[PDB]
Amino acid sequence: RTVGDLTWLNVSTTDVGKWIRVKGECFVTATDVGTWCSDSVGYECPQIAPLDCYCRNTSTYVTYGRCKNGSRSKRAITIAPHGEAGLRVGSTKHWTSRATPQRYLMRVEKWVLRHPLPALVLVVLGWMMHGQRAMYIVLMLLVA
Amino acid sequence: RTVGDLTWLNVSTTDVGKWIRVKGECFVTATDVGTWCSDSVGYECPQIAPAYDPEDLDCYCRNTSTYVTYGRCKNGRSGRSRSKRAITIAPHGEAATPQRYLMRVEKWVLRHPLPALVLVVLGWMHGQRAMYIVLMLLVA
Amino acid sequence: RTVGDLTWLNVSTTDVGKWIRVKGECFVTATDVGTWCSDSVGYECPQIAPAYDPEDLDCYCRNTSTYVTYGRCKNRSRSKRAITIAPHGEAGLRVGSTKHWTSRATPQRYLMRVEKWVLRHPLPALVLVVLGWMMHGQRAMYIVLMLLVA
Amino acid sequence: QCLDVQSRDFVQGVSGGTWVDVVLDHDNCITIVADGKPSFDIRLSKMSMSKFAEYKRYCLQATMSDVTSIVACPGDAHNDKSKNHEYICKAVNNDRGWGNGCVLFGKGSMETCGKFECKKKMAGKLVARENVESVVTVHVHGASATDTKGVDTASTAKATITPKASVATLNLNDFGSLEVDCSTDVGMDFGEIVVADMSGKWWIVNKDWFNELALPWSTASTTAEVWQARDRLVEFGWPHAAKQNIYDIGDQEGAVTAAIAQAPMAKWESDKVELISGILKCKVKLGNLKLRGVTYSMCAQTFTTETRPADTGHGTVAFKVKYVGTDVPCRVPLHIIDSDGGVAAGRVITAHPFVMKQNDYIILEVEPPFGDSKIEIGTGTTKLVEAWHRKGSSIGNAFTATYKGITKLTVLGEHAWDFNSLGGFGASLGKAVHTLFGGVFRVMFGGMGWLTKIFVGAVLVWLGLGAHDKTIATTMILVGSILMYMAV
Amino acid sequence: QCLDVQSRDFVQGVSGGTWVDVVLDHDNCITIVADGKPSFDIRLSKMSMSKFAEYKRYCLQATMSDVTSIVACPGAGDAHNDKSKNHEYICKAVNNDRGWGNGCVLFGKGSMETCGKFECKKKMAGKLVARENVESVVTVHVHGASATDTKGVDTASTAKATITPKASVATLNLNDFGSLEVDCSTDVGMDFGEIVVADMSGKWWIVNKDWFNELALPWSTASTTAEVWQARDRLVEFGWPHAAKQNIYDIGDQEGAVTAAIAQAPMAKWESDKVELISGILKCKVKLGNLKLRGVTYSMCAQTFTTETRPADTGHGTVAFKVKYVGTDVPCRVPLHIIDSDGGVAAGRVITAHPFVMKQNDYIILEVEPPFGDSKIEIGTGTTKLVEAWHRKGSSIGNAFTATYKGITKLTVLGEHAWDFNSLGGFGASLGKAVHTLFGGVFRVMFGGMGWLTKIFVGAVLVWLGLGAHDKTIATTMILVGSILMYMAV
Amino acid sequence: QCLDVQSRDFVQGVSGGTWVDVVLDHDNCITIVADGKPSFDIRLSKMSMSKFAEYKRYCLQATMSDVTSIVACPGAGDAHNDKSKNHEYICKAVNNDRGWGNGCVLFGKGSMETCGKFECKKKMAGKLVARENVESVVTVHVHGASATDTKGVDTASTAKATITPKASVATLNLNDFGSLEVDCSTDVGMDFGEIVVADMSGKWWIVNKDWFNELALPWSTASTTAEVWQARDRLVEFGWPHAAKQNIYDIGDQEGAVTAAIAQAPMAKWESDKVELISGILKCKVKLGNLKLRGVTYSMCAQTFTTETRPADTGHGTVAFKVKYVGTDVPCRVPLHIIDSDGGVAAGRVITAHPFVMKQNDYIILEVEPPFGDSKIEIGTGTTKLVEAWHRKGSSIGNAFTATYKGITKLTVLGEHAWDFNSLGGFGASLGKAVHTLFGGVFRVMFGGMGWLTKIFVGAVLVWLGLGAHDKTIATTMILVGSILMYMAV
Chains in contact with chain B (at least 3 beta-carbon pairs closer than 8 A): C, E, F
Q: What residues of D are in contact with residue E75 (Cβ under 8 Å)?
A: 237, 240, 245
Architecture category of domain C1-74 in CATH: Sandwich (2.60)
- Is E452 near chain C, with CB under 8 Å? no
Instruction: Write the DSSP assignment of E92-133 as a string of letters.
Output: EEEEEE--TTT--S--SEEEEEEEEEEEEES-EEEEE--SSS
- Residue contact E257–B87, C-beta within 8 A: yes
CA distances from F29 to D68, E427, F8, F41, F232 (A): 62, 104, 5, 7, 52
- The closest CB to that of B57, out of E73, E102, E207, belongs to E102
Q: Do the chains F and D touch each other, judged by at least 3 C-beta pairs below 8 angstroms?
A: no
Amino acid letter, D63: T
**Alpha helix (H) residue ranges in E120-235:** 209-214
- The closest CB to that of C13, out of B18, B53, B56, belongs to B53
Which value in Å is the resolution of this experimental model? 4.4
Cβ atoms of F243 and F98 closer than 8 Å = yes
Residue of B36, B47, B55 to mutate for E, most E C-beta atoms under 10 A: B55
Pick among 1.10.287, 3.40.1710, 2.20.25, 1.20.1280: CATH of F397-487: 1.20.1280
Kindly report the nearest CA distance between residue C78 and chain E, in angstroms.
7
How far is E105 from E109, CA to CA, in rounded Å?
Answer: 12
Contact pairs from chain A to chain E, CB under 8 Å: 20
CATH of domain D395-487: 1.20.1280
- Residue contact E74–D240, C-beta within 8 A: yes
CB atoms within 10 A of CB D28: 18
For chain D, the straight-line distance linking the first and the last C-alpha, in angstroms and rounded, comes to 29
Nearest to C36 by CA among C12, C16, C53: C12
Instruction: Give the residues after which the backbone of chain C is interrupted, taking a C-to-next-N distance over 2.5 angstroms as a break.
Output: 22, 75, 135
- Is B79 near chain C, with CB under 8 Å? yes
Amino acid letter, B30: A
How far is C146 from F391, CA to CA, in rounded Å?
Answer: 53
Instruction: Write the DSSP assignment of B44-98 as a string of letters.
Output: ---B--SSS---S-SEEE-SS--EE--B--TTSSPPP-----------------H
Cβ atoms of E334 and E306 closer than 8 Å = no
- Residue contact A42–D192, C-beta within 8 A: no
Amino acid letter, E484: I
Residues 6+ apart with CB under 8 A from A134: none
b/e map D103-132, b = 16+ CB within 10 Å:
eeeeebbbbbbbbbbbeebbbbbbbeeeeb
Instruction: Write the DSSP assignment of D456-475 as a string of letters.
Output: HHHHHHHHHTSSS-GGGGHH
b/e map E94-124, b = 16+ CB within 10 Å:
bebebbbbbbbbbbbebbbbbbbbbbbeebb
Residues 6+ apart with CB under 8 A from E196: E55, E126, E127, E128, E129, E206, E207, E208, E209, E212
Kindly report the nearest CA distance between residue E64 and chain C, in angstroms.
18
- Is D101 near chain E, with CB under 8 Å? no
Handedness of CA E422, E425, E426, E428 (dihedral sign): positive
The helix/strand/coil state of F253 is coil
CATH of domain E9-48+133-192+271-287: 2.60.98.10
Kindly report the nearest CA distance between residue E433 and chain B, in angstroms.
27
Architecture category of domain E55-126+195-263 in CATH: 2-Layer Sandwich (3.30)
- The closest CB to that of B53, out of C29, C58, C75, belongs to C75
Architecture category of domain F56-124+228-262 in CATH: 2-Layer Sandwich (3.30)
Tell which E residues from 43 to 82 touch D, by Cβ distance under 8 Å: 74-75
CA distances from F7 to F3, F41, F240, F441 (A): 9, 13, 68, 17
Kindly report the nearest CA distance between residue D238 and chain E, in angstroms.
7
Q: Do the chains C and A touch each other, judged by at least 3 C-beta pairs below 8 angstroms?
A: no
Residue D194 is inside which H or E element, if any? strand D193-197
List phi, psi (to 5°) of E408: -60, -45
Residues 6+ apart with CB under 8 A from D385: D374, D375, D376
Side-chain half-sphere exposure of F212, counting CA atoms within 13 A: 25
The helix/strand/coil state of F392 is strand
State the Rg of chain D over Cα. Answer: 35
Residue count of chain B: 140
CB atoms within 10 A of CB D213: 22
- Residue contact B17–C18, C-beta within 8 A: yes
How far is F71 from C44, CA to CA, in rounded Å?
Answer: 7
Experimental method: cryo-EM
Instruction: Write the DSSP assignment of E343-384 as a string of letters.
Output: S----S-BSS-S-EE-SSSEEE--EE---SEEEEEE-SSSTT
The helix/strand/coil state of F155 is coil
Residue intervals in chain F for CATH 2.60.40.350 = 312-392
Residue intervals in chain D for CATH 1.20.1280 = 395-487
Q: Which residues pair with E33 in a beta bridge?
A: E12, E39
Kindly report the nearest CA distance between residue A75 and chain E, in angstroms.
15
List phi, psi (to 5°) of E128: -75, 155
- Residue contact C95–F211, C-beta within 8 A: yes
CA D72 to chain centroid, in Å, comes to 67
For chain C, the straight-line distance linking the first and the last C-alpha, in angstroms and rounded, comes to 82
How far is D196 from D215, CA to CA, in rounded Å?
Answer: 14
- Residue contact F99–B80, C-beta within 8 A: yes
Name the CA dihedral angle for E451, E457, E462, E467, rounded to a multiple of 10 degrees. Answer: 170
C79, closest residue in chain E (CA to CA)? E240
Kindly report the nearest CA distance between residue F289 and chain C, in angstroms.
38
- Residue contact E105–A69, C-beta within 8 A: no
How far is E196 from C45, CA to CA, in rounded Å?
Answer: 54
Where exactly are the structural domains of chain B?
1-75, 98-139
Superfamily covering domain D9-48+133-189+270-285: Tick-borne Encephalitis virus Glycoprotein, domain 1 (2.60.98.10)
- Residue contact F99–B84, C-beta within 8 A: no
Cβ atoms of E451 and E346 closer than 8 Å = no
Q: Do the chains D and C touch each other, judged by at least 3 C-beta pairs below 8 angstroms?
A: no
How far is B80 from D97, CA to CA, in rounded Å?
Answer: 44
Q: What residues of B are in contact with residue F99 (Cβ under 8 Å)?
A: 75, 80
- Residue contact B31–C56, C-beta within 8 A: yes
How far is F230 from B87, CA to CA, in rounded Å?
Answer: 32
Contact pairs from chain A to chain D, CB under 8 Å: 104
How far is F487 from F490, CA to CA, in rounded Å?
Answer: 6
How far is D242 from A29, CA to CA, in rounded Å?
Answer: 12
How far is F174 from F152, CA to CA, in rounded Å?
Answer: 17
Tell which D residues from 221 to 250 touch E, by Cβ distance under 8 Å: 237-238, 240, 242, 245
Pick among 3.40.50.970, 2.60.40.350, 1.10.3720.10, 3.40.50.2300: CATH of E305-392: 2.60.40.350
Contact pairs from chain B to chain E, CB under 8 Å: 113
- Is F106 near chain C, with CB under 8 Å? no
Cβ atoms of D32 and D8 closer than 8 Å = no
Cβ atoms of E95 and E77 closer than 8 Å = no
Q: What residues of A are in contact with residue E75 (Cβ under 8 Å)?
A: 30-32, 52
Contact pairs from chain C to chain E, CB under 8 Å: 3
Residue of E240, E245, E246, E249 to mutate for C, most C C-beta atoms under 10 A: E240
Nearest to F229 by CA among F81, F152, F145, F121: F121
Residue of A79, A89, A93, A102 to mutate for D, most D C-beta atoms under 10 A: A79
Instruction: Give the residues after which the backbone of chain E is interrupted, taking a C-to-next-N distance over 2.5 angstroms as a break.
Output: none
CATH of domain A1-68: 2.60.260.50
Q: What residues of B are in contact with residue E104 (Cβ under 8 Å)?
A: 46
- Is C31 near chain B, with CB under 8 Å? yes
- Residue contact E105–A52, C-beta within 8 A: yes
Q: What residues of B are in contact with residue E240 (Cβ under 8 Å)?
A: none
Architecture category of domain D293-392 in CATH: Sandwich (2.60)
Instruction: Write the DSSP assignment of C117-145 as a string of letters.
Output: HHHHSHHHHHHHHHHHHH--THHHHHHHH
The helix/strand/coil state of F457 is helix
Fold of F312-392: Immunoglobulin-like (2.60.40)
- Is E77 near chain A, with CB under 8 Å? yes
Name the CA dihedral angle for E155, E159, E162, E167, rounded to a multiple of 10 degrees. Answer: 170
Q: Which residues of C touch F (CB under 8 A)?
A: 30, 38-48, 50, 52-60, 76-89, 91-92, 95
- Is E189 near chain B, with CB under 8 Å? no
Between helix A116-128 and helix A131-143 the angle, nearest 10°, is 140
Nearest to F390 by CA among F368, F422, F358: F368
Kindly report the nearest CA distance between residue E410 and chain B, in angstroms.
18
CATH of domain D56-126+193-260: 3.30.387.10
Superfamily covering domain B1-75: Flavivirus polyprotein propeptide domain (2.60.260.50)
- Residue contact E108–D245, C-beta within 8 A: no
Classify E396-486 by CATH class.
mainly alpha
Q: Which residues of B touch E (CB under 8 A)?
A: 38-49, 51-59, 81-85, 87-95
- Residue contact B58–E207, C-beta within 8 A: no
How far is A99 from A86, CA to CA, in rounded Å?
Answer: 18
Instruction: Give the residues after which the backbone of chain B is interrupted, taking a C-to-next-N distance over 2.5 angstroms as a break.
Output: 22, 95, 125
